[PDB]
Amino acid sequence: MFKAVLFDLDGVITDPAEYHFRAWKALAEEIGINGVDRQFNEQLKGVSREDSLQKILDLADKKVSAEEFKELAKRKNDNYVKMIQDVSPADVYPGILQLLKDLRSNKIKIALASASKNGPFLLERMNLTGYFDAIADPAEVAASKPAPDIFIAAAHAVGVAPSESIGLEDSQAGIQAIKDSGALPIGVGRPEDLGDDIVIVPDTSHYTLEFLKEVWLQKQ
Ligand SMILES: [Mg+2]
């Protein structure tokens, strides 16, 4: 039996998309650039902040100095942080509150393995703090996804080996990270996106304790 479960934040527990959208819309209104609408945002999924901005600049063939580029990206981060004040328990994906409760109930360790500098705060905002046993520090990490680094850390943080854990992810860099760390991955999202050799669910509503158990045993 598995002894821990390692969660990414974005894509698994909550959908940050709307909040990154409001942050980028605010920025583009404020520097007079047309085109940053929902459909345009969609093609920023798991795209670097710096890469994100260049795309936005490109919408107007805009050229800025190196100092202005970094100043503008910070200002977006600031808007993002004003925005997430509105995050709440309604933001929690489906099946996740019940799972965390079933995981705590059966004494199975629960850890966050996310790259977000706002992890602890977001969880507090979502009333999920009591359920978490540890939170991997993204600053202490050497390399990022698809590195196995963040996941090893989370696992050791709750006192288990990666080989004793199931990892949950929506991105394939994440899947790869979980694959290389030793944990058993179970992704969520479309197969076309994530790969052949892992177990996948259409959405988080499928992440139940009963089901994680079945898989874990099937894999053994
Ligand atoms: Mg993710």
From Swiss-Prot:
- What name does UniProt use for this protein? Beta-phosphoglucomutase
What gene is this protein translated from? pgmB
Q: Active-site positions, per UniProt?
A: 8, 10
Q: What is the lineage of its organism?
A: Bacteria, Bacillati, Bacillota, Bacilli, Lactobacillales
Specify where it is mainly localized. cytoplasm
Q: According to its UniProt record, which protein family does this protein belong to? A: Belongs to the HAD-like hydrolase superfamily. CbbY/CbbZ/Gph/YieH family.
Which pairs are disulfide-linked? none
Q: Keyword Glycoprotein: yes or no?
A: no
Protein modification: Autophosphorylated.
Q: Which residues bind beta-D-glucose 6-phosphate?
A: 10, 46-47, 49, 116-118
